[PDB]
Amino acid sequence: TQMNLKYAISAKNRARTVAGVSICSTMTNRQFHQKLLKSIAATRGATVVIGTSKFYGGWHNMLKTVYSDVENPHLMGWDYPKCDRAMPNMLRIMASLVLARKHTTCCSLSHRFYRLANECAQVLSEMVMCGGSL
RNA sequence: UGGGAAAUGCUACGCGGUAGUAGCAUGCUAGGAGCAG
Numbered sequence: 001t002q003m004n005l006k007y008a009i010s011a012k013n014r015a016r017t018v019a020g021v022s023i024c025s026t027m028t029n030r031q032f033h034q035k036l037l038k039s040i041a042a043t044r045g046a047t048v049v050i051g052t053s054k055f056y057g058g059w060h061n062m063l064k065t066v067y068s069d070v071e072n073p074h075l076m077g078w079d080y081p082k083c084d085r086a087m088p089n090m091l092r093i094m095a096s097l098v099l100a101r102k103h104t105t106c107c108s109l110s111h112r113f114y115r116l117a118n119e120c121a122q123v124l125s126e127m128v129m130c131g132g133s134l
Numbered sequence: 135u136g137g138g139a140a141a142u143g144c145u146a147c148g149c150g151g152u153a154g155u156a157g158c159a160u161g162c163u164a165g166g167a168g169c170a171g
């Protein structure tokens with residue numbers, strides 16, 4: 001995985017970073033996961049709001065769907081300090097397990113395990129080329 | 135002795151096809167830009 005510095009505008013001098021991934025990983029991941037990702041992005045009015053425009057009154061519909069029948073409602077929100085740098089890898093494994101539950105028929109058992117192994121070898125913990133070294 | 139067809143032109147109507155013109159909606163593609171995590 002190659003690492004690079006960003007070039008954008010922000011309100012704190014801490015640096016930002018992007019990471020490019022090799023091509024074979026992207027090809028195989030697209031083929032394995034694309035259908036579910038599209039299905040998630042298409043569905044409207046659910047718990048996950050990825051793919052819902054904030055234009056044309058979509059924002060109002062989201063804010064109304066969350067405001068379902070709650071007797072004494074209040075509003076609550078929180079913040080994760082260093083979410084990307086500090087997520088314990090057990091939860092990442094479990095997250096990658098949930099997304100793969102859809103593959104009951106398109107894949108066997110050993111195929112599922114090897115797909116999980118490739119994912120952990122390519123994205124979870126592997127060799128990062130920063131500067132000029134590994 | 136209470137029996138009539140066709141070839142021509144005009145007009146009107148409808149259909150079909152052709153072309154050209156304008157409008158509408160969409161589907162694709164390409165390009166450029168902006169926002170968010």
Ligand SMILES: [Zn+2]
Nearest residue numbers: 032103106107
């Ligand atoms: Zn599969």
